């Protein structure tokens, strides 16, 4: 399945429809890709084939 989510996911009791920061976070987080990191923190480009 393919999911494109832009709203704020709620992780408490208050409705986090458009408010985030106190108990709810943005579901999308960018990758940390530094060339000075180790081998296990390098961007590997992967393709599928079924």
């Amino acid at each position: 399945e393919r999911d494109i989510s832009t709203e704020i996911y709620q992780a408490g009791n208050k409705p986090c429809n458009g408010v985030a920061g106190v108990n709810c976070y943005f579901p999308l987080q960018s990758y940390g890709f530094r060339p000075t990191y180790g081998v296990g923190h390098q961007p590997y480009r992967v393709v599928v084939l079924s």
Partner: antibody
Amino acid sequence: VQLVQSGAEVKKPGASVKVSCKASGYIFSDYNIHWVRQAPGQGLEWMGWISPDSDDTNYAQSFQGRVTMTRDTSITTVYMELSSLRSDDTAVYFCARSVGYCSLNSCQRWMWFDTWGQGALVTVSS
Amino acid sequence: PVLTQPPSASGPPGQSVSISCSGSRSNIGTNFVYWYQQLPGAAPKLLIYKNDQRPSGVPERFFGSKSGTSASLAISGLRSEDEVDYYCAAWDDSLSGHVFGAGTKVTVL
């Protein structure tokens, strides 16, 4: 690092200014240049950002064809054409060296402008 | 549109001065808000990024926070270099463009 550029004097409206924020002191393959003018008194008006690898540029929803950004590789500068200048946006232009490279419109959440070069006083009147 | 800021949130030295950065529903509340520093008649610079940490060379005394609809920046103590301007910047999905502050000037008493 430094972001030195040329300076344009006052001119009659109905022309095109030309400045070039030179990318010096760093390799120009991993940064982006964001353009914003600082009007005296009121707030800031942000234009857009460019891409080194490509002209992949995003424009603001207020100005579309009145401002155009193009780049070059050997000289490693940026060229602007500001057609149809008006006498209501007399402001100085800043180029900022921001970390992070993105091409999508849903990227602006984790990058910021580190170093701001000195501006080129540009203003509109006859 | 533009963010809402007080015109001049001044404060006498010897205590703390608080400045607010209130925007809209989609402006501040779902995206991380920023704070910038500008010298009078000079190029601006970053002041807080990501509302929790500061770059090198920035004093530890300076601190910022967020609530859900507005941003708060807390400073304490004013000197001859503390009359500089403070701007607050944010971003939104509705306009797809960076929106800065309105301009706040602080002076000693």
